[model samples]
Target: AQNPNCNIMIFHPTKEEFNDFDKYIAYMESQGAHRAGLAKIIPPKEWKARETYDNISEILIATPLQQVASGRAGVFTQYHKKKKAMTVGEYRHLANSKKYQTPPHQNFEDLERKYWKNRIYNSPIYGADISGSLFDENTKQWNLGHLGTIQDLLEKECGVVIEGVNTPYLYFGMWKTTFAWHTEDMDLYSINYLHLGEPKTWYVVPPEHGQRLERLARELFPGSSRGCGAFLRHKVALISPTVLKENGIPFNRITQEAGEFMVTFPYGYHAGFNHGFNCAEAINFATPRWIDYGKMASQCSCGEARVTFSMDAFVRILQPERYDLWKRGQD
Candidate 1:
């Protein structure tokens, strides 16, 4: 109870870590992270599961509104009748099942390969972990230093005041070839920002409505991929609150633009795909509840990394009986 707001931790770059941080930030800033580009729109010549947003223009210029809308339709129509899971339980089950072929258990690189090999454009999707890796300067990849700054803002600046987040949890996004309409890994509260690239998303209807849609979608369009009513990916919208509906329902027509961020709570059904020409980059940070953290990381190899030390851990130390409070709810 003493330090409930500890999940939002931030680690800024020190003098020694400054160079790495800057390179990472620079890449993120220029290369941008949401929309990769147009070429990524259609699947590549080879893989149906893989895609590529490899178009690297000197500077990105916005096309016409009609063109953007047309682009959306083309992409959306590609996976209109695919199959997908309707519940978190199903997603988790399949994620761990042999029915689905995920990356190798320990090899993150192979994970990336298995992901991109399926789609044509080869755009980045889900399951890619972009932490601690040195950013390539020429590519303008944002360094961890700048990312640490954003984390500070989310944790110290905003979290210290509101949302009460004060620590960091698993933070990863934008590795080409992975999609997570079925992320049962870590059930933490997270947000995705379409800072520099294009991001297409299918925010499942809220639990209440999304479930119904999923049921109907299954009956009507069984076996949907990331698209086709299965919560397709989204490109970076220019409007704030890019997506506001559940399961891509679009609560409001307001388009969330570049630089604007959106929060995705636990239990919320959502997934994304990079939309732009250059490699789309985005940030995914979370503040996991104890139970969510425990359930997700319980099967991890580096299990310690998932749930090392948390605020609740300390609470148990101070007031042993308070463990019951964990089962209950807290605002």
Candidate 2:
């Protein structure tokens, strides 16, 4: 119940099907896919053959469309548009005043663009999904909690039980405009279950050495152009436990077409991004669950043993000093 990355899989069943790729692409493309086009990759074909899967095994094949960073120009434009319309100072006032607890101040057009762009354009790498948020009527925001329960149901429905050493749990939070990367505790897999908007960009590194590569990449080109970073975007190129053994690199990229995509992170150093693709629409959501066969075998706690941290607690794990303000209101 605790491990999210490797324990379970997120499923996106649309309860419908199209006759062909043209029809399917046409519908998704109409949903701002062409204009926004978050994560860019080759279009899909009718049947995914064995060879295609084999190629994916060889190289990191992610839907670049969904994995765009939250600060890209496309995302910025939307945020700027919203910011101009709502005004940040005004919205913050509304939020702070509790006049509108969930302020309609989604200044995604202007403020979100400007801030998110500047916020994540450097050392900090945060990732969001492509399918976007599945607004929970209960929480009034994307709820991974609900999704986790559903995933569990799906597992049971599929006749799959938590056996052996692999099982994933659920985690949730937003990266309050400032966050950084760290090692997830166990060998886990990750994926985006997009619900609201375009795709996102995901950069990943292998287990154990993933962080080393990222630091090295950062050091090699501390102040280089984004293109240099793009060149160094290594995770998208590799995935698989044997990545180190075979490719000797710890990185991979996977794409989800405004839907759920499975990401297999082997429990070490890895990172990702939505690239502001959804900044105009909300660019981030993450599950803090992981999976490890050995860990599962060793666990003594039950699902009920899990504890919930305050929003500030999880955020502090990413950016500590920035959370000084978080302590103000929680009587």
Candidate 3:
């Protein structure tokens, strides 16, 4: 009764199959992969067999002192937080050291009991900007800024690099380090690659079930969205898979390992935790199909959790002279 069957589509593409990868991804989506709200890609064994790479070995880099909740968070649950101030390599050393064995959480109950009588421990090094980082010189697939995925219609329409909307970011994870549930800003699609480490488990709700997920999340996290829109976007609400199943909120689970990629479709909601120690990079992108999502996201939820660009302004710029032509091909 773990609700163990994962109906999400998994693709095992070879190196040779990556030519025109964008077209292939679009093809996959057309076949209904996007309906799952998350897609996983497993590259050939030869591609990821060797985990060591000189470029990304810079785990020695420093990160700001940070704190993260050590357990699954509800909208108002108190945090069993862990704090840390260490360099990337320092954390990596500890992660691989015998004294700091990563603990396991077989289920939500086990996860809640990971550290203390009623709390867990976590210190996921997240939100570090990838700008001016060594990854700028890394491989295409692992480099968030340089990924050759679907045509980012938003990037093309804007004709320039923009922050948050397109800037790539990096995350360092350890046991029980959870990312709260949310969709990408502006409902854009996002891709994440686990550069190296043990698998990271993800729970994603399909885009088709987005409304059902939201209604349930709102019910689970009362008062959160009373004066707001899409309270989950606040990144403060999380419910365990077991409870989600009990409530009949459809979701899929995937374990993303090193060299694999996970894509969260436009408006798809997802949340999960790291298995142990790992490095991952992610960035948001959009196909033209996302324009409608952006426009819809313009509903302006009553919170800072919402973000947007000038949707009508962008359309006006791209289509300055074509209402009549837009109607009948004669301007």
Candidate 4:
């Protein structure tokens, strides 16, 4: 079978769920919603259109976060932390390097505080979760249509509104600004909407094949004492679709064009690169199905150790909302 476990399915918006928020959520959930797929909004308007935010360089330069290019691999992949912002021109000049360069590296007293505060917007590993960000002046920029429905419901009923976690992240990406292979935090469901510019090339490995890929990484990079940590730090070689195919691993590929949404299911291993300069907005949410993945993700070891949320904390906060959704059931 070309598709296994019903993974890697794409949905073109029909009149049903494309416009109906509740139907859209059901559509995502009904597919057993793991794996990465596209949700194309029909009759896309300007605001929903990519042209609305075509000036990627202008947007980054204006944002408060440092726009430095020193640590393309390090800062973006969560291996290095940047102390100050760099100018766009400087970043453009030093775009490509085999090694990530950063100023005299300093690990902080409180890694979480430093990581969340500076890197959330400054570095590629994290993005400014606008809806929940205190730093940004306008938080409700894209809180409209289907994306808005999930955000609004989670915050209003679930008592869950954490910046850079559940809220939508404003991603500013340029060439080789790679998000190394990883899954959603706590394996929660995530929706990524590319607001504008060049398409991002995505490589997705199904959930069932996730562990196999992990094993292959260990065998390939035995020198990495940290095991799977090598991939996170860019020590291991890149995992492209060809690489997966050679290893007999089943995976899927999709280029996320402008005005499209890329949805990744729980525990799906995904990594990708920006074709060129671009801006994207993304966020994570949960259905009752995600509870199991949330537990496992809490225990996993990888880059950015301190960033994962506590399962206990989530349960306490999200129980009411979870209960409500279950009661409503499917229509």
Candidate 5:
């Protein structure tokens, strides 16, 4: 809240300006929206999460428990410590229960102590596959999963299907459930649509400061990397903006409400927490501009970059006729 750099652009696009999302995104870049590393887009109408909600409310979901206090800076997978199976409706009640709020503890010892006393468990349902089929007829035009640039370019142009990457990942969140600081896979851009929910607060560090933030994270966790420089990609470290700002790294904040779209720029390091009960959908996308970023991300010394897809195959598709040029251009 104290960081002045948190002022990010919020676009209120009328139906007309938003109908052509690809062009609208180009217009956004023209307006220098990418410089902020993040921006919020509010459409004339939300993409209709409620219509789909009533249908999926009773579905059983497995949620990994968050060691409340530790999750703030704890390992994403390690915090799991359990795979609690519950229905979406059941978790929604827990999220909204006023009796269970942020436990009165910051110290790790008391954090678990407070949770045990209160018998509270906070878990977020991430990557719930709501993209493939769960959509009303009219919503398809604005569906986050069915975007022109994302779907057309990835699947049609390249013929690749990487679920949760090119495809959409639905998220169910509750108070203080968090995503730690990290960049998208291969530095690709990501857009998140808050189908319906309370505010989801986001904090991002632009690419120019991305490296500095990474160094600071390593500084904060001395041996966590354990000789692997790219352990940050594990997506388990949460460093507060105030802490980052204190270390001279710049950041921006976005408070995404229901029906709004939050876009994370290439190479931007981002993290955030849910304010309350909410359902959001997100997907990764790449513009031609992302090619260079992908090159750099893949060439990193550590981390198995692009384990989900073949970068060489992607480039082959994008540059189908450039084999001769690629062979001779190396000279």
Candidate 6:
């Protein structure tokens, strides 16, 4: 089942990769961000995440958004919201000083323990419905500076509105906050930019091997469903690149540092754990090639058809001579 073409890619964008804002858009469009493998693009110094969200109160502590109680067991939980609340500054301190305690792991299965008895804090500050603009109300607009960049254009134009999947979310993890393996909602592409702090170690499985890994996971976790929710379900086991490698499935590893951007393609199953403490922002977006996959995902058992765009609207946006003219000669 191994194909020579199945491999992850990392891109370091130099001056030649992009010129002005328009040229950058052309490069992003031509590359088709939702391909089978993971793509990490290190933009030029001027466009790094640190330049915009370098401050504490910028994207991490914005007021308009409400915080939710999250933990290793159920990242979003209602049980501890009342008693487990902690200030953003307090959580930030834990991340920087590594002051929290976590259970020891004999294997990846330890990731799914019911009571994550040693979790640092319950409510991880998450911006549920923050505006597409990653702006800080107090200081200068955070997003305005990158209005012409590829990330900005994708957020402004191709972004979708699924009930729980739309809009960007700010993540602050101390030590080993884990995001399990899964694909994007409606099989769309995603961009994660580390605004500041330490790094997140990632394990990326190419799209071609997504089902293979899923089957292996099913065998490892008895009585687990084969549906999309399987990855997030309680009994689901955590499978890292090491585990997959032992099982003969190939995956690539990357340690994404601050100021770097990681892109996940359609159907690519990826999982990761935060290093010491860090803050990052992420959002999902779609493109012309995503229409058919979105449609299929809507009809499938995943039950994520709630996404905002309709097929007709997608086609209409693709029409209009101006849209085509702008996209002309680009991929």
**Which candidate leads the pack in lDDT?**
5
TM-score of 2: 0.30
User: Tens digit of lDDT per residue, candidate 5, span 53-118?
Assistant: 667677565653553334333322223445577777887887767743444455443443342233
Candidate 6 or 3, higher TM-score:
3
Q: lDDT by residue for model 3 over 1-331, one digit each (tens)?
A: 1112426888877777654556767876766788888888887655542335555545443443233443343322222233445667677776666644466568644544453232233343442334333343434443556654333465675564333334666777666556768887667788887877767788899776778888887777666668566567566566777677888989987778787889888888898777677878787777767777765652323433433343233333344453232223211
User: How high is the CA lDDT of each candidate model?
Assistant: 0.29, 0.30, 0.62, 0.49, 0.63, 0.51
Clashing residue pairs for model 6: 70-122
Best by TM-score: 5
- TM-score for model 5? 0.75
lDDT of 4: 0.49
What TM-score, computed on C-alpha atoms, does each candidate reach?
Answer: 0.30, 0.30, 0.73, 0.61, 0.75, 0.62
For model 6, the stretches where C-alpha displacement exceeds 4 angstroms are: 1-4, 15-36, 48-83, 101-166, 226-237, 298-331
Distance from true position, residue 32, model 1, in Å?
Answer: 30
In Å, residue 162's CA in model 6 sits off its true spot by: 11
Candidate 6 on 96-214: residue-level lDDT in tens?
55334334455333542312343335333322223444435432212332332323333355674322224566676655555656677556677787767767777777776777876
Error of 6 at 327 (Å): 35
Steric clash count of candidate 6 = 1
Model 2: how far residue 234 lies from native, Å = 21
Report the C-alpha lDDT of model 4 over 254-316, residue by residue, as the tens digit.
677776777777777777666545567776766655666654552223432334243334533
Candidate 4's C-alpha runs over 4 A off are: 1-7, 20-22, 29-51, 54-165, 223-237, 301-304, 308-312, 315-331
Q: Which ten residues in a row have the lowest lDDT in candidate 5?
A: 298-307
Of 2 and 3, the candidate ranking higher by lDDT:
3
- Candidates 3 and 6, the one with greater lDDT: 3
